[PDB]
Amino acid sequence: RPRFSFSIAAREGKARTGTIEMKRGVIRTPAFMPVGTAATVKALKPETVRATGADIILGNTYHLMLRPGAERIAKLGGLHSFMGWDRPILTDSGGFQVMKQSEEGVTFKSHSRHMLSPERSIEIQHLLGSDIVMAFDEVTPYPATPSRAASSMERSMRWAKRSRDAFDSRKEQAENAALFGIQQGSVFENLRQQSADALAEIGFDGYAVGGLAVGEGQDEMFRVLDFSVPMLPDDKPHYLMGVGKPDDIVGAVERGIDMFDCVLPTRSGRNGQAFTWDGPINIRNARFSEDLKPLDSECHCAVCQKWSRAYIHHLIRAGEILGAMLMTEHNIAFYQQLMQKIRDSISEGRFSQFAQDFRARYFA
Amino acid sequence: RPRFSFSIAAREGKARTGTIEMKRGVIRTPAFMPVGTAATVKALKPETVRATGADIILGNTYHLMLRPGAERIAKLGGLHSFMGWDRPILTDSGGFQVMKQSEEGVTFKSHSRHMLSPERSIEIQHLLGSDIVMAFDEVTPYPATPSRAASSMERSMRWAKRSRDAFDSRKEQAENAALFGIQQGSVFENLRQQSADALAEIGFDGYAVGGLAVGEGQDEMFRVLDFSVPMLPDDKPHYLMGVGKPDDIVGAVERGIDMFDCVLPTRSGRNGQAFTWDGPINIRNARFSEDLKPLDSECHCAVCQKWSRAYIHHLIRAGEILGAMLMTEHNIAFYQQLMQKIRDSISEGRFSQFAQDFRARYFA
Ligand SMILES: NCc1c[nH]c2nc(N)[nH]c(=O)c12
Ligand SMILES: NCc1c[nH]c2nc(N)[nH]c(=O)c12
Ligand SMILES: [Zn+2]
Ligand SMILES: [Zn+2]
């Protein structure tokens, strides 16, 4: 396999399906990336993560630098070796978790004093041995005034160039990993356009839509995606960071997004929320205490093959670790089955029908 | 397979190795039973418990009756079905967790008001669908005066007869499960003898040594085992309840014990303690932060095949669920490997040498 090759196999409207080939493996798109905060996808062995269908996972630069430490992970052979996941890993840059500041970067106290900058973020991602490296950005909160959105976007573009140069100057990283740029601009079309133009001029292997799902509603997010995604190079992956709910994902794919990550299936799994084709349920609810059905009636995951709602209800009620394990495996598997249905439907030219059918049932 | 058949294949001094055959499977002895407190061996799927080598697990009557409830489990098809473990399950009777009281039984408040008695304990164990049912006893704390030890022992023997009759009166239970009696008498030889005689007169499928590992030291426990185990019928299994550490197990086998359970490998696994052939280690210790070796250098478990001390150190430090999962799997696997080495050495007539070698290295 090459360092990086994105190929689009089929299209339907703005939606695409295809593959990213990298040295450590192939990623089928549209893709969902489980989040492995501090070198673990919570409550799952890597083999279980793979068994659910994941092709790639996400690691958080900010958290890993705080514990166990980036240099330590490098000394131990890199993140893949450390955690036992040998397929691609994407690392975020830390901009989201950040949100003293200056044009040079940021200093902050560990929740010890730490520093992030375009150069240091790229370095940490190198030390981790990331396959997909993200530019270091400044993420403005919502709502943002046009002036402040413009300032953070402009700084992010200067930082995107610094990220590009840092990545390129490190031969081993440049030859073996990929670098994605991050579009900013809040909800403003003109700023989103300026940001897309700046990133395309610099040139990246992929383009993330940053700064969404930070407090604007789905309607607004979709409105911004409507104009923002077409601004990005068509022939590279489009990554919507930190999204999201199943319906968010479907609508974002309809608008040209190829990659997703979110803590929702894992975090809310531990909390008792299980995804089903008829919408989410909270397994802690008393109505499930004697329900012998699986979490979802169609799901092919090992959890739905083997255990009842009643059992998982008890485990979560009781605070048992196995409850977190089973909920998380099911939810991640559900997400991967959603992505597979999306990929197949686009391939077969029936994605619009799938989206309609999905919504009708999920929100019944 | 029969309802119950214990066969002794080989002996060395007081030590024995053999098999218990039951309808749901064969149990190799000496046996270690992982404890599954409230219908789960903490942090492990049942398939993982089996993969470590366990032939049987223990469930706690007291806890299960409180949550999710015995009647509820019965309605859902029994404990095996509920938790997904299809091999034998032994249930304790509740006497240990108990320790208003009367000759009829005990009432207590949930940590709702609940009741236990010989009849109710046997009933709960039936509702759970237990394969090995334990008589309901009264467990005196250590130290005990001779008078109080005698009173609790005598009550326990009356309760053993009530347990026997309750079990026998329930045809489905009598035909498909086994019933073990529990010897009491604290540290007193005469009381232990009276208790053994009473239990043998009633007749049970197996005999537990109760009331030890409740505050007396290993020396005292071993002294009591020295005279107590030979009092029990030789041709039935001997079960030392709530023991214990690897060295406890080895010494108890040397004294004629066939079955063990304890929370130690699971509970202390979650706390950071890993068993090794060179003694226990606490993985949280800073000395392990960059140690690339497996938990134990010889252990054949999947954890030792795949992850380093450094990684598990980080997980436990961070409070990650995967840390509990990996520690627990390793510790249970270690215990099963200990039992296998014990069984093989007795079979081969070299158990005394094994015990000496084990101690020399474990305590080096
Ligand atoms: N939802 C927005 C988001 C999530 N993670 C992120 N990481 C970075 N660097 N930038 C961003 O805008 C975001
Ligand atoms: N270590 C003693 C012990 C553990 N569990 C027990 N359960 C019962 N019923 N009786 C006992 O004596 C014990
Ligand atoms: Zn499922
Ligand atoms: Zn091991």
Side-chain angles (χ1 to χ4, degrees), chain A residues 6 27 63 78 88 127 141 147 150 212 251:
Chain A
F6 178 53
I27 302 150
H63 294 287
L127 289 168
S147 169
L212 296 180

PDB file of all heavy atoms in Angstrom, chain A residues 6 27 63 78 88 127 141 147 150 212 251:
ATOM      1  N   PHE A   6      -6.748   8.044  -1.795  1.00  0.00           N
ATOM      2  CA  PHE A   6      -8.205   8.059  -1.650  1.00  0.00           C
ATOM      3  C   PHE A   6      -8.835   7.852  -3.007  1.00  0.00           C
ATOM      4  O   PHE A   6      -8.551   8.587  -3.959  1.00  0.00           O
ATOM      5  CB  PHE A   6      -8.665   9.394  -1.064  1.00  0.00           C
ATOM      6  CG  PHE A   6     -10.165   9.533  -0.913  1.00  0.00           C
ATOM      7  CD1 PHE A   6     -10.918   8.580  -0.242  1.00  0.00           C
ATOM      8  CD2 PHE A   6     -10.814  10.661  -1.404  1.00  0.00           C
ATOM      9  CE1 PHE A   6     -12.284   8.750  -0.072  1.00  0.00           C
ATOM     10  CE2 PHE A   6     -12.184  10.842  -1.225  1.00  0.00           C
ATOM     11  CZ  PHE A   6     -12.914   9.890  -0.555  1.00  0.00           C
ATOM     12  N   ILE A  27      -9.159   1.923   4.703  1.00  0.00           N
ATOM     13  CA  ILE A  27     -10.283   2.513   5.400  1.00  0.00           C
ATOM     14  C   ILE A  27     -11.442   2.674   4.416  1.00  0.00           C
ATOM     15  O   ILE A  27     -11.325   3.382   3.424  1.00  0.00           O
ATOM     16  CB  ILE A  27      -9.894   3.893   5.976  1.00  0.00           C
ATOM     17  CG1 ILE A  27      -8.698   3.765   6.928  1.00  0.00           C
ATOM     18  CG2 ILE A  27     -11.084   4.564   6.639  1.00  0.00           C
ATOM     19  CD1 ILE A  27      -7.823   4.975   6.979  1.00  0.00           C
ATOM     20  N   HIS A  63      -5.017  14.499  25.505  1.00  0.00           N
ATOM     21  CA  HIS A  63      -5.064  13.582  26.633  1.00  0.00           C
ATOM     22  C   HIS A  63      -3.801  12.741  26.739  1.00  0.00           C
ATOM     23  O   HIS A  63      -3.234  12.597  27.829  1.00  0.00           O
ATOM     24  CB  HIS A  63      -6.324  12.733  26.573  1.00  0.00           C
ATOM     25  CG  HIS A  63      -7.571  13.536  26.758  1.00  0.00           C
ATOM     26  ND1 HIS A  63      -7.936  14.059  27.980  1.00  0.00           N
ATOM     27  CD2 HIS A  63      -8.519  13.936  25.880  1.00  0.00           C
ATOM     28  CE1 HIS A  63      -9.064  14.734  27.848  1.00  0.00           C
ATOM     29  NE2 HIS A  63      -9.441  14.672  26.584  1.00  0.00           N
ATOM     30  N   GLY A  78       5.665   3.495  20.308  1.00  0.00           N
ATOM     31  CA  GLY A  78       4.569   4.145  19.610  1.00  0.00           C
ATOM     32  C   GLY A  78       3.201   3.647  20.044  1.00  0.00           C
ATOM     33  O   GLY A  78       3.070   2.613  20.693  1.00  0.00           O
ATOM     34  N   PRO A  88      -4.711   1.671  10.958  1.00  0.00           N
ATOM     35  CA  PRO A  88      -4.506   3.118  11.046  1.00  0.00           C
ATOM     36  C   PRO A  88      -5.103   3.753  12.296  1.00  0.00           C
ATOM     37  O   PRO A  88      -6.116   3.290  12.843  1.00  0.00           O
ATOM     38  CB  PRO A  88      -5.196   3.627   9.776  1.00  0.00           C
ATOM     39  CG  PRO A  88      -5.014   2.488   8.799  1.00  0.00           C
ATOM     40  CD  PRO A  88      -5.287   1.293   9.651  1.00  0.00           C
ATOM     41  N   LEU A 127       5.488  11.480  17.620  1.00  0.00           N
ATOM     42  CA  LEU A 127       5.928  10.625  18.716  1.00  0.00           C
ATOM     43  C   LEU A 127       4.956   9.473  18.964  1.00  0.00           C
ATOM     44  O   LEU A 127       5.364   8.360  19.281  1.00  0.00           O
ATOM     45  CB  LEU A 127       6.087  11.441  19.990  1.00  0.00           C
ATOM     46  CG  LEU A 127       7.273  12.415  19.997  1.00  0.00           C
ATOM     47  CD1 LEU A 127       7.168  13.386  21.166  1.00  0.00           C
ATOM     48  CD2 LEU A 127       8.620  11.674  20.019  1.00  0.00           C
ATOM     49  N   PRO A 141     -15.753  29.191  19.900  1.00  0.00           N
ATOM     50  CA  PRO A 141     -17.024  28.650  20.382  1.00  0.00           C
ATOM     51  C   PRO A 141     -18.217  29.253  19.641  1.00  0.00           C
ATOM     52  O   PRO A 141     -18.085  30.291  18.990  1.00  0.00           O
ATOM     53  CB  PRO A 141     -17.041  29.072  21.858  1.00  0.00           C
ATOM     54  CG  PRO A 141     -16.190  30.279  21.914  1.00  0.00           C
ATOM     55  CD  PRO A 141     -15.102  30.052  20.905  1.00  0.00           C
ATOM     56  N   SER A 147     -16.336  39.080  13.601  1.00  0.00           N
ATOM     57  CA  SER A 147     -14.940  39.493  13.807  1.00  0.00           C
ATOM     58  C   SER A 147     -14.103  38.409  14.468  1.00  0.00           C
ATOM     59  O   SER A 147     -12.993  38.118  14.028  1.00  0.00           O
ATOM     60  CB  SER A 147     -14.821  40.761  14.657  1.00  0.00           C
ATOM     61  OG  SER A 147     -13.454  40.953  15.021  1.00  0.00           O
ATOM     62  N   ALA A 150     -13.612  35.428  12.251  1.00  0.00           N
ATOM     63  CA  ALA A 150     -12.604  35.714  11.241  1.00  0.00           C
ATOM     64  C   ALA A 150     -11.186  35.643  11.820  1.00  0.00           C
ATOM     65  O   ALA A 150     -10.292  35.072  11.201  1.00  0.00           O
ATOM     66  CB  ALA A 150     -12.868  37.055  10.575  1.00  0.00           C
ATOM     67  N   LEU A 212     -17.849  22.795  14.136  1.00  0.00           N
ATOM     68  CA  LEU A 212     -19.286  22.526  14.190  1.00  0.00           C
ATOM     69  C   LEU A 212     -19.585  21.573  15.339  1.00  0.00           C
ATOM     70  O   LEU A 212     -18.665  21.071  15.992  1.00  0.00           O
ATOM     71  CB  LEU A 212     -19.806  21.986  12.852  1.00  0.00           C
ATOM     72  CG  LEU A 212     -19.696  22.971  11.685  1.00  0.00           C
ATOM     73  CD1 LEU A 212     -20.234  22.343  10.406  1.00  0.00           C
ATOM     74  CD2 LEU A 212     -20.435  24.275  11.980  1.00  0.00           C
ATOM     75  N   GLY A 251     -27.300  12.609   7.581  1.00  0.00           N
ATOM     76  CA  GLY A 251     -27.440  13.893   6.927  1.00  0.00           C
ATOM     77  C   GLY A 251     -26.114  14.479   6.458  1.00  0.00           C
ATOM     78  O   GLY A 251     -26.050  15.158   5.431  1.00  0.00           O
TER      79      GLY A 251
END
